[PDB]
Amino acid sequence: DPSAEAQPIVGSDLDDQLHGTLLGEEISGGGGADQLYGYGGGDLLDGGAGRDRLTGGEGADTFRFALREDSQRSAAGTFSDLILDFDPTQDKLDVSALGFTGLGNGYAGTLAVSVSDDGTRTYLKSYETDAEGRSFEVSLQGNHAAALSADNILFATPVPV
Ligand SMILES: [Ca+2]
Ligand SMILES: [Ca+2]
Ligand SMILES: [Ca+2]
Ligand SMILES: [Ca+2]
Ligand SMILES: [Ca+2]
Ligand SMILES: [Ca+2]
C-alpha cells in the first residue's frame, strides 16, 4: 500500500536484538548473531551472515534465503539460521536465491530433512561433505516437513523437491 509496502527495516551488521511483533513489517540485518522476533503480522526477514535466531510466529511469513555461505556448516562450526515458531502448515520459506542443491537424502551434494520432536524442530542440512564441501544448514521450529510442498518452500533446483 502507499502507506507502507512492508519494506524491511534495515538493521545493522552488528548482533541485532530487535523486534517486529504485530507490525506487518520485518527487520533485515546481514551480519552479526541476530535475535529477531517478528510474531504478529506478515513478516519479511533476511537473517544474513552468522548463526541467527529468527522468530516469526503468526502469519504466512516469508523468511527468505539469499544467504548462502551465510547459512553454511562445518565440523569446525556452523553458521546457520534457526527459525523459531514457524509452523501453521502455511508458512513460507524461500531458498530459490541459493539455487538449492536438492533434497535427495543428503547425498550427491543435496540436503536431507529430519525432524526431532524433542527439539520440536525440523533441521535441513547435508552431511556427505564437510571439509571437502562445506554444506548448508537451516533449522525451523515445527514439523512442517510433513507439509513439504512447493507452496511451503520455494526453490530453484533443476529437479523439483
Ligand atoms: Ca545484524
Ligand atoms: Ca545475521
Ligand atoms: Ca511482524
Ligand atoms: Ca509473523
Ligand atoms: Ca509464521
Ligand atoms: Ca545465518
Side-chain angles (χ1 to χ4, degrees):
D1 289 1
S3 24
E5 296 292 354
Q7 298 105 298
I9 300 184
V10 45
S12 186
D13 289 313
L14 199 63
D15 286 19
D16 295 315
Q17 184 143 231
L18 296 171
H19 65 252
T21 66
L22 270 62
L23 238 171
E25 192 166 80
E26 221 56 57
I27 297 97
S28 185
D34 303 313
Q35 299 190 77
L36 295 171
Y37 314 81
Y39 309 121
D43 296 349
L44 295 175
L45 218 170
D46 330 80
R51 187 151 63 190
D52 302 284
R53 178 191 181 183
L54 309 177
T55 106
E58 183 270 307
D61 305 310
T62 304
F63 279 23
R64 62 206 176 191
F65 288 76
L67 19 152
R68 199 172 191 272
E69 282 63 46
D70 280 1
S71 201
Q72 78 195 334
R73 59 151 230 85
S74 65
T78 79
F79 301 97
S80 42
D81 294 273
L82 287 71
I83 301 171
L84 298 181
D85 63 354
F86 221 75
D87 196 7
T89 70
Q90 293 285 276
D91 243 323
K92 187 64 184 175
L93 221 295
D94 172 36
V95 293
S96 63
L98 308 188
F100 199 73
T101 56
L103 203 63
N105 306 305
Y107 54 69
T110 69
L111 270 66
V113 55
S114 176
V115 59
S116 119
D117 297 306
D118 62 294
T120 331
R121 267 164 286 169
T122 185
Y123 308 90
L124 290 82
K125 66 180 79 190
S126 179
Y127 36 65
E128 184 181 52
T129 53
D130 191 299
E132 310 73 24
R134 84 292 169 187
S135 16
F136 305 114
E137 177 181 281
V138 296
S139 180
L140 176 146
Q141 189 180 16
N143 288 50
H144 112 116
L148 252 165
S149 64
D151 50 275
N152 269 240
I153 307 184
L154 184 64
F155 48 79
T157 136
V159 60
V161 294

